[PDB]
Structure 1
Amino acid sequence: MKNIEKLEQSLTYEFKDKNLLIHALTHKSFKKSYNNERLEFLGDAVLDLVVGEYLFHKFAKDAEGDLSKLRAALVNEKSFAKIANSLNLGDFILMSVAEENNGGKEKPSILSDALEAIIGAIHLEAGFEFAKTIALRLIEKNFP
């Protein structure tokens, strides 16, 4: 994949298995029996823990507060698509010609899914703590 090195610089994480990252960037329309849906499923749960944990510590000395609402605001499709657009994910997602023609590169659900899949892939290769640091930095940079 061309310019993939630039995605890695943006994340500050370089994959040991480049095919894992490619897997994460493969939209379901692209190739039969090979896509990011499962990595997205895992990534979603990783981010739920990254964000829930961050909120538990940051709002610890405050009995008032709905951490669930605070989390939902941070991990929803719109926020994740914004983070993904900051990484120019649209340029790296592999999808069919027809899906590109259908505006697949800016679909927030496609962008959001791919970000989640990248975080799940980092968790698999480097572990939760490493994925957490990468995710928290992306969140910080987009929602100071």
Structure 2
Amino acid sequence: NIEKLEQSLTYEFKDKNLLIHALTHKSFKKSYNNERLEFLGDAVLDLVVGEYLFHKFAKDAEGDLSKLRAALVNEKSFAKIANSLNLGDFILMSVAEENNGGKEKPSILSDALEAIIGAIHLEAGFEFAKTIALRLIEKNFPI
């Protein structure tokens, strides 16, 4: 069913397993989860948003850029974007995790979104991941 997600992203994965990896919560399967991709995606997003703010607010001091970036690159914002993509429908987690409300946990939603951006960067490069991420941000925060 991940095809629906690809359509929402405007990005079709060459390696489908890579998207599944990004969608795999830590509860699901031994030694296979989205934590490394989330690490990579978070670094991607800090550059995407930092660069965006640097250009958009040419007169803003570093402190302003930093705080504005914190206001965008965070669990709440990413969980919002995740929900706009119905990510809870695609994330893989154990029965117990789902019964404990995992599909609605902001951390799980946020982590999966960041891992997806990491996965797009891995497969397609920074500039591509940037264009995808900026579209999602501009649809959710029309700043």
Using structure 1 for the length normalisation, give the TM-score: 0.96
Distance in 1 (CA, whole Å) between partners of 2:25 and 2:80 is: 18
Between the aligned partners of 2:14 and 2:62, the Cα distance in structure 1 is 43
4+ residue runs of structure 1 moved beyond 2 angstroms? 61-65
Output one character per residue of 1:56-115: Cα deviation in whole Å (capped at 9) or x when no partner.
Answer: 000114459700010011111000000000000000000000000000000000000000
SS at structure 2 position matched to 1:66: helix
Asked whether the equivalents of residues 39 and 121 of structure 1 are also in contact (C-alpha less than 8 Å), the reply is yes
Q: Count residues in correspondence.
A: 142
Q: Distance in 1 between matches of 2:62 and 2:53?
A: 13
- TM-score, structure 2 normalization: 0.97
Structure 1 vs Structure 2: percent identity of aligned residues?
Answer: 100
| Counterpart Cα distance in 2 of 1:139 and 1:73 | 12
Two-structure CA RMSD over aligned residues (Å): 1.1
> Residues 32 and 63 (structure 1 numbering): CA distance in 2 closer, same or farther, change over 3 Å?
closer
Point out where structure 1 has 5 or more consecutive residues left out of the alignment: none
Alpha-carbon distance in structure 1 between the residues aligned to 2:136 and 2:89: 18
